[PDB]
Amino acid sequence: MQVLHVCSEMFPLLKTGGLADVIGALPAAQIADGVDARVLLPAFPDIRRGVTDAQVVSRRDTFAGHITLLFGHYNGVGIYLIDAPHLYDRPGSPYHDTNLFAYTDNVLRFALLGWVGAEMASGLDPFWRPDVVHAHDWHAGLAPAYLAARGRPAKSVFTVHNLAYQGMFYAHHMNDIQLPWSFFNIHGLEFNGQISFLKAGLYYADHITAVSPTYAREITEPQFAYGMEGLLQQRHREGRLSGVLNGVDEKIWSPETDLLLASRYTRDTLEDKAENKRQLQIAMGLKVDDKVPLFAVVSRLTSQKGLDLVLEALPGLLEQGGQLALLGAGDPVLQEGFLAAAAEYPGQVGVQIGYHEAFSHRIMGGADVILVPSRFEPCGLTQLYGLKYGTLPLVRRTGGLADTVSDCSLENLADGVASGFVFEDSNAWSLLRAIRRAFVLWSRPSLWRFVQRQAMAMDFSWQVAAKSYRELYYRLK
């Protein structure tokens, strides 16, 4: 079984979100479970410089110009690079320049990634050819379309990490990307008058996966599918739609082992987490106080995440004795909003705007509650990290969050399954009730500790996940 993941990020080389963490870990898991997984990424500079044993495999002209295909290893997995510097040799984001605008040639940049992914099914590498091309999100969405145009020399799976990003390009571009003009159709890649790379993935793949069981269902609803629910419902009935929950990488997210933390700790020695708390309080500039719950946020700041509700509920949170530590980047309305909040309530709100990998560890390791109050959430790795760090997650019952967190309800406490806090509707009031709940639990320290241990007993394993994908790759044959 040979699989090629086609995608545009991979931790630790280049990461803008959860996709990178999946790509950084799933292939190794799959290899453990007896699938020969390789990864194909565009040669962005950070990726290129991480893969130091990369040799030339071949060299092609292409509708977007010349690529030289490289192959190397990284962390014991086979990595293919699309080396096309006129497209990819640009600093910073895969997706947009330094003043946050999509590169005007994105349509070529990502069509090519899709294209190379499909060429591998046909022998671009004379020595290795995948049986399944596994494509991730809109960036790799044309790969199944290129594969359909060639008569499907390999079976394809497209997995949606997030339905909200649709990869829309002007229809004329049908002219620049080398696909049959016939593919521009509602039964194909056309979507609301433009080209959709997402639609191309959803339509042309042999099978579609979402990154959690409940999100696989939610995307058959209009509330989450944004116009695609028609395709998704059909594809559901055909048995071509499923969810496979993400794992977490234990090499990099485990308090037992985590070298970025002031102090390491375990499910049985939670006393050792205290010190991470003091240090976080200091670093953020909060009153150093162990008698008080410290809530935390680590996320992209965009409407998806519900953070404006956190903002809205903060007075109520502070009024009960709580602290807030925030680390995140995006919506300047939110950035500014949160910065304002920290100014107004110094010593009880700390806020670092920006992206800092290592500091998210120091937060995960130090806080009592991580807040993930998403409007929608295909998986959400941060609450999985909070579970593992025994920092209890406070989430909205949607997507992966619904799949992975159990509320402190009396049944749940009694069955020994409660692992955090869940609220139901997208508004400050509904969130504030979960906040109150956490204040109540906090005043029953035994119970808090009991829930902490259950949180830290949940297991999110990539090798378990691999097995599900393996089953899929065999069903498609």
Ligand X SMILES: OC[C@H]1OC[C@H](O)[C@@H](O)[C@@H]1O
Ligand Y SMILES: O=S(=O)(O)C[C@H](O)CN1CCN(CCO)CC1
Go through 56-75 and write b for each residue having 16 or more CB atoms within 10 A of its CB, e for each that does not.
Answer: ebeeeebebeebebbbbebb
User: Of 19, 67, 294, 401, which lies in the binding site for ligand Y, with binding defined by CB under 6 A?
Assistant: 19
Question: Closest distance between ligand X and the C-beta of residue 215, in Å?
Answer: 8
User: Of 17, 72, 285, 316, which lies in the binding site for ligand Y, with binding defined by CB under 6 A?
Assistant: 17
**Which residues are documented as binding site for ADP-alpha-D-glucose?**
15
Of 89, 163, 149, the closest CA to residue 115 belongs to 149
CA distances for 21 relative to 5, 26, 260, 266, 382, angstroms: 13, 8, 17, 23, 11
Of 10-18, 184-192, 251-259, 307-315: span binding ligand Y (CB under 6 A): 10-18
Residue 395: both structure tokens together? 């989430």
Q: Measured at the alpha carbon of residue 396, what is the angle toward residues 392 and 400, in degrees to the nearest 5?
A: 85
Site string for ligand ADP, 328-367 (x = CB under 6 A): xx-------------------------xxx--x-------
Nearest residue (CB) to ligand Y, 374 versus 452: 374
Of 11-19, 34-42, 144-152, 183-191: span binding ligand Y (CB under 6 A): 11-19
- 398 binds ligand ADP per the rule CB under 6 A: no
**Cα–Cα distance between 314 and 322 in angstroms, integer?**
9
Nearest residue (CB) to ligand ADP, 113 versus 327: 327
User: Of 167, 255, 373, 380, which lies in the binding site for ligand ADP, with binding defined by CB under 6 A?
Assistant: 380
Question: Closest distance between ligand Y and the C-beta of residue 57, in Å?
Answer: 27
Residue 136, Cβ neighbours under 10 Å: how many? 26
Sign of the CA dihedral 439, 324, 452, 457?
A: positive
Of 161-169, 198-206, 212-220, 439-447: span binding ligand Y (CB under 6 A): 161-169
Residues touching ligand Y, count (CB under 6 A)? 10
Question: Closest distance between ligand X and the C-beta of residue 85, in Å?
Answer: 28
- 161 binds ligand Y per the rule CB under 6 A: yes
Of 401, 410, 411, the closest CA to residue 458 belongs to 401
3-state helix, strand, coil in the chain (%, to 5): 40, 20, 35
320, with CB counted inside 10 A (0-12, 13-18, 19+), is: middle
Residues in contact with 177: Cβ distance below 8 Å, sequence separation at least 6, in sequence order: 63, 107, 108, 111, 115, 142
| CA atoms in the 13 A half-sphere facing the CB of 270 | 19
* 3-class state of residue 309 by DSSP: helix
Per CB under 6 A, residues contacting ligand X are 17-19, 22, 161-162, 211, 246, 377-381, 400
Of 17-25, 126-134, 225-233, 436-444: span binding ligand Y (CB under 6 A): 17-25
Nearest residue (CB) to ligand X, 147 versus 379: 379
Residues touching ligand ADP, count (CB under 6 A)? 17
211 binding partner (options ligand ADP, ligand Y, ligand X, none; Cβ < 5 to 8 Å by kind)? ligand X
Question: Closest distance between ligand X and the C-beta of residue 165, in Å?
Answer: 9
User: Of 18, 337, 373, 399, which lies in the binding site for ligand ADP, with binding defined by CB under 6 A?
Assistant: 18
Question: Closest distance between ligand X and the C-beta of residue 396, in Å?
Answer: 12
CA distances for 266 relative to 171, 256, 361, 386, 457, angstroms: 55, 5, 15, 13, 11
**Which residues are documented as binding site?**
15
User: Of 212, 382, 404, 452, which lies in the binding site for ligand ADP, with binding defined by CB under 6 A?
Assistant: 382
Q: Measured at the alpha carbon of residue 36, what is the angle toward residues 34 and 38, in degrees to the nearest 5?
A: 145
Of 43-51, 99-107, 375-383, 460-468: span binding ligand ADP (CB under 6 A): 375-383
298 binding partner (options ligand X, ligand Y, ligand ADP, none; Cβ < 5 to 8 Å by kind)? ligand ADP
* 3-class state of residue 187 by DSSP: coil
Give me the residue whose beta carbon is nearest to ligand ADP: 18
95 binding partner (options ligand X, ligand Y, ligand ADP, none; Cβ < 5 to 8 Å by kind)? ligand Y
- 162 binds ligand Y per the rule CB under 6 A: yes
Question: Closest distance between ligand X and the C-beta of residue 216, in Å?
Answer: 12
Of 72, 79, 17, 15, the closest CA to residue 302 belongs to 17
User: Of 83, 137, 258, 368, which lies in the binding site for ligand Y, with binding defined by CB under 6 A?
Assistant: 137
Angle between helices 142-149 and 106-120 (to 10 degrees): 50
Structural contact between residues 426 and 434, judged by C-beta atoms closer than 8 angstroms: no
User: According to CB under 6 A, which residues from 280 to 299 bind ligand ADP?
Assistant: 298-299
Residue 303: both structure tokens together? 């409407």
**φ and ψ at residue 66, rounded to 5 degrees:** -80, 130
**Cα–Cα distance between 40 and 460 in angstroms, integer?**
25
Contact residues for ligand ADP, defined by CB under 6 A: 17-18, 21, 298-300, 327-329, 355-357, 360, 379-382
Contact residues for ligand Y, defined by CB under 6 A: 16-19, 95, 102, 137, 161-162, 165
